[PDB]
Amino acid sequence: PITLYSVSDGPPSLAVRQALEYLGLEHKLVNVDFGIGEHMTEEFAQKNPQKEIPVLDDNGFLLGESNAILQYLAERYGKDDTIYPKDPMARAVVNHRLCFNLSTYYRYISEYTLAPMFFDYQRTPLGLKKTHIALDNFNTYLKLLGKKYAAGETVTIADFQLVTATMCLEAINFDISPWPLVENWYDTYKLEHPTLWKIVEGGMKELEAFE
Amino acid sequence: PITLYSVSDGPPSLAVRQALEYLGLEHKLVNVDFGIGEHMTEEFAQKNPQKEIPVLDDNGFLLGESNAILQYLAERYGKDDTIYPKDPMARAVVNHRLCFNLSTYYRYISEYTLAPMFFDYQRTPLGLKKTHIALDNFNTYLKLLGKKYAAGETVTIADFQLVTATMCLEAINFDISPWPLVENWYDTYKLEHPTLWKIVEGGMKELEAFE
Numbered sequence: 001p002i003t004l005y006s007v008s009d010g011p012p013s014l015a016v017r018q019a020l021e022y023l024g025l026e027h028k029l030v031n032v033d034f035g036i037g038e039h040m041t042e043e044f045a046q047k048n049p050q051k052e053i054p055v056l057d058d059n060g061f062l063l064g065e066s067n068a069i070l071q072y073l074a075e076r077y078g079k080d081d082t083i084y085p086k087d088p089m090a091r092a093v094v095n096h097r098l099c100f101n102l103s104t105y106y107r108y109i110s111e112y113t114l115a116p117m118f119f120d121y122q123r124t125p126l127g128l129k130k131t132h133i134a135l136d137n138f139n140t141y142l143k144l145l146g147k148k149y150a151a152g153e154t155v156t157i158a159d160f161q162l163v164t165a166t167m168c169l170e171a172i173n174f175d176i177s178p179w180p181l182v183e184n185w186y187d188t189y190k191l192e193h194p195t196l197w198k199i200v201e202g203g204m205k206e207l208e209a210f211e
Numbered sequence: 212p213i214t215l216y217s218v219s220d221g222p223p224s225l226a227v228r229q230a231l232e233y234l235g236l237e238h239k240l241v242n243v244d245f246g247i248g249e250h251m252t253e254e255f256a257q258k259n260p261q262k263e264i265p266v267l268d269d270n271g272f273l274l275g276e277s278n279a280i281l282q283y284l285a286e287r288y289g290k291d292d293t294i295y296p297k298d299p300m301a302r303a304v305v306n307h308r309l310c311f312n313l314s315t316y317y318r319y320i321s322e323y324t325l326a327p328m329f330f331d332y333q334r335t336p337l338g339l340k341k342t343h344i345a346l347d348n349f350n351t352y353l354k355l356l357g358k359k360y361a362a363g364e365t366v367t368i369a370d371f372q373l374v375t376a377t378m379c380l381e382a383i384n385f386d387i388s389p390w391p392l393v394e395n396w397y398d399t400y401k402l403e404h405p406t407l408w409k410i411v412e413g414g415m416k417e418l419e420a421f422e
């Protein structure tokens with residue numbers, strides 16, 4: 001079987017869960033922030049030095065880092081390659097956007113939105129400026145590629161990540177209308193993939209309560 | 212033709228250059244920190260909103276993010292898949308280590324070593340602790356996988372990145388002997404891939420001068 005160790009309102013976990021839903025993959029979900037889930041990772045803590053969540057357990061194969069989990073699930077499962085194309089150039093655009101999310105978009109958004117929620121970290125003007133730069137960059141990338149989704153004309157695993165990062169801004173009532181291509185993309189995602197957005201919305205609601 | 216826009220002593224650039232050498236790919240190298248290189252990216256600055264370096268220009272296809280550049284070069288070129296295996300599980304270990312480098316290993320090392328060199332950023336005990344955690348994690352990953360290299364028994368594109376991150380510690384005379392598996396891996400890399408280490412060493416020497 002497949003088991004996902006996850007944080008119920010963690011954007012990386014929510015990215016992986018959208019992929020599992022899109023691919024129709026049965027799995028056990030362990031929310032490590034829910035009740036006894038805290039201890040349900042003890043069976044493999046020496047194996048994740050980073051205290052790594054999410055972690056995917058595919059029939060004994062343990063894999064961390066949400067980007068790598070998504071790249072693995074999409075290559076190994078599914079009837080076609082549309083969410084992670086095999087063509088090297090098409091794939092490179094997906095891989096680029098996944099790197100952009102990890103290094104820049106979700107890096108700066110998460111530091112401004114979530115870190116102050118759950119830590120003694122402070123929101124600052126500099127953190128706000130970096131959030132604006134990340135949104136500028138994403139708006140420009142959408143304009144440059146010229147397609148409906150972040151790495152193609154249809155959804156890919158890059159969108160699964162970028163959506164959960166953008167949701168962090170919504171969770172704190174951050175107005176994204178200054179980035180019209182990002183706003184249009186986000187609304188289009190929700191309209192065309194309601195069962196995927198539904199997963200992310202459940203996490204958003206938890207975050208709004210503890211904003 | 213292929214053109215690489217690079218920073219002569221930038222670890223991400225040096226990772227890509229090792230791949231170009233390993234794959235035997237002829238290319239034009241533009242060091243944007245050398246003389247007139249500063250302006251030689253003006254022909255595509257609207258196209259890289261992040262002020263993105265390195266950037267690969269493969270016959271008109273422009274690709275940023277060093278991880279994505281490496282994943283593209285290794286899939287598109289080369290006679291075998293040993294530096295980026297096609298098998299989904301073997302590939303997932305490479306992808307995981309690339310994510311680990313971006314999110315954690317090079318993230319914390321670069322903030323402790325290089326950012327204070329070239330900015331008003333300060334070395335702190337917390338930054339040192341995070342460097343130690345990153346090295347702990349890498350030592351544990353090498354032990355867990357149990358292989359000679361970071362994602363297999365032979366070199367992969369993950370090693371090209373992890374080597375340039377570790378070089379930043381060497382550039383400031385940081386002793387890595389408390390992490391014996393990392394030290395052994397680093398020395399083995401240099402012994403078995405001298406033409407690749409040579410590229411990285413040239414950048415190290417520039418960084419040592421301005422440490």
Ligand SMILES: N[C@@H](CCC(=O)N[C@@H](CS)C(=O)NCC(=O)O)C(=O)O
Pocket residue numbers: 007009010011012013051052053054064065066067314
């Ligand atoms: N780079 C990792 C980040 C995962 C992550 O940050 N997980 C959080 C929960 S949202 C955690 O539990 N620990 C890491 C932290 O301190 O942020 C990924 O994409 O999977």
Ligand SMILES: N[C@@H](CCC(=O)N[C@@H](CS)C(=O)NCC(=O)O)C(=O)O
Pocket residue numbers: 103218220221222223224262263264265275276277278
């Ligand atoms: N995530 C990017 C990082 C590239 C990067 O940081 N490049 C540096 C030179 S080493 C730069 O020129 N600008 C970004 C910065 O401010 O660090 C990658 O892996 O390619």
